[PDB]
Amino acid sequence: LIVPYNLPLPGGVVPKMLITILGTVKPNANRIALDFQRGNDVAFHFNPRFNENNRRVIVCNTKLDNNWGREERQSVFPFESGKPFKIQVLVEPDHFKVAVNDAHLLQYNHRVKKLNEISKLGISGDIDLTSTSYTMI
Numbered sequence: 001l002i003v004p005y006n007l008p009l010p011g012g013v014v015p016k017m018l019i020t021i022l023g024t025v026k027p028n029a030n031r032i033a034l035d036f037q038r039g040n041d042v043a044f045h046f047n048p049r050f051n052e053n054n055r056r057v058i059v060c061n062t063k064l065d066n067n068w069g070r071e072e073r074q075s076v077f078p079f080e081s082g083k084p085f086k087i088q089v090l091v092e093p094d095h096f097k098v099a100v101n102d103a104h105l106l107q108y109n110h111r112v113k114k115l116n117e118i119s120k121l122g123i124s125g126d127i128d129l130t131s132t133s134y135t136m137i
């Protein structure tokens with residue numbers, strides 16, 4: 001699986017949908033990013049950063065055409081350079097729930113409300129990708 005990886009969501013996203021990504025962070029990793037795209041927009045951007053002025057952070061946000069909105073920043077950061085990881089996204093009616101290695105990490109309230117239009121996930125950054133899977137209910 002070559003990264004940047006596009007994972008089609010031809011059904012769009014639906015409540016109860018579960019996306020599971022398995023991989024390994026490369027050595028000396030700078031960033032990871034998951035990008036749920038709807039048309040000209042990024043409905044949900046999940047962006048671990050290994051070094052922003054000597055703190056790890058995960059930045060979350062939504063892009064509407066060329067403009068990023070209000071940043072949500074979170075410090076819980078389970079990833080490590082060289083190490084295997086599992087990221088699970090569960091879609092709920094009012095938010096995306098994100099768990100990393102079987103422990104809950106954050107939730108991100110939908111800003112793009114037409115879930116069925118979110119037709120792709122992009123997986124990029126400093127990772128080897130092993131598998132993807134989702135469940136479309």
Ligand SMILES: OC[C@H]1O[C@@H](O[C@H]2[C@H](O)[C@@H](O)[C@@H](O)O[C@@H]2CO)[C@H](O)[C@@H](O)[C@H]1O
Nearest residue numbers: 045047059060061062068069070071072
């Ligand atoms: O909000 C997610 C996007 O952030 C962008 O960088 C922001 C940066 O985090 C903030 O501190 C300030 O400098 O504005 C930057 C430009 O919007 C990234 O460029 C983009 O890729 C997203 O991760």
